[PDB]
Amino acid sequence: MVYVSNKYLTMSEMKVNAQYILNYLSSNGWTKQAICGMLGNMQSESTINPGLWQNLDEGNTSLGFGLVQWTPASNYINWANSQGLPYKNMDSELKRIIWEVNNNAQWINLRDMTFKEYIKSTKTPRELAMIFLASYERPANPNQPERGDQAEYWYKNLS
Numbered sequence: 001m002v003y004v005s006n007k008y009l010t011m012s013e014m015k016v017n018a019q020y021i022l023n024y025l026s027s028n029g030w031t032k033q034a035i036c037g038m039l040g041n042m043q044s045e046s047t048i049n050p051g052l053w054q055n056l057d058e059g060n061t062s063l064g065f066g067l068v069q070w071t072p073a074s075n076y077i078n079w080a081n082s083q084g085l086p087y088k089n090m091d092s093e094l095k096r097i098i099w100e101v102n103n104n105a106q107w108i109n110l111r112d113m114t115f116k117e118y119i120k121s122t123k124t125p126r127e128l129a130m131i132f133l134a135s136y137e138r139p140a141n142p143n144q145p146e147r148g149d150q151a152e153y154w155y156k157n158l159s
């Protein structure tokens with residue numbers, strides 16, 4: 001059971017999605033820390049909503065979409081379509097992230113950590129949130145410490 005929509009999710013809704021993601025990526029060998037650092041980013045990017053378009057601008061494929069706000073959205077949507085997966089879909093988005101780890105896409109090593117190091121890391125969810133921000137997300141504004149607070153909130157509050 002997950003929320004998928006073009007709307008900002010409440011804390012309770014985010015928690016449902018966030019536990020789903022933790023379960024899913026644990027089976028694909030990520031640490032709880034690495035997953036929570038990424039969750040702290042996804043909260044700021046999309047309120048952890050796989051259905052969410054940047055500015056709630058539905059159908060604008062030039063801008064951000066989905067859990068991590070793939071920009072331009074077409075980078076991701078093209079991949080889903082080309083792969084025969086529905087793009088507006090929790091699992092399709094997690095499959096993209098796994099595909100990126102596997103093919104060393106998206107990640108730029110700015111912090112002397114590779115993506116494959118990242119998903120096996122037991123550094124703090126705060127430290128990982130900051131590394132994921134700098135290496136994977138890379139938004140115009142870089143000092144977004146909120147993302148680390150959030151990573152710690154999910155690590156505490158999920159199972």
Ligand SMILES: CC(=O)N[C@@H]1[C@@H](O)[C@H](O[C@@H]2O[C@H](CO)[C@@H](O[C@@H]3O[C@H](CO)[C@@H](O[C@@H]4O[C@H](CO)[C@@H](O)[C@H](O)[C@H]4NC(C)=O)[C@H](O)[C@H]3NC(C)=O)[C@H](O)[C@H]2NC(C)=O)[C@@H](CO)O[C@H]1O
Pocket residue numbers: 045064068069070071072136137138139140141
């Ligand atoms: C206002 C705001 O911040 N909007 C947010 C989005 O910016 C953000 O999405 C992320 O945006 C950045 C910057 O536009 C983007 O980072 C760029 O990624 C490309 C890789 O595709 C890099 O370009 C390549 O560089 C290498 C080496 O120089 C070349 O070999 C290659 O040819 C280049 N490819 C092309 C086609 O350009 C850029 O160097 C790099 N720029 C920066 C500043 O790092 C991220 O990939 C975007 N993130 C995601 C997840 O897609 C989004 C997420 O925070 O949120 C919006 O709010």
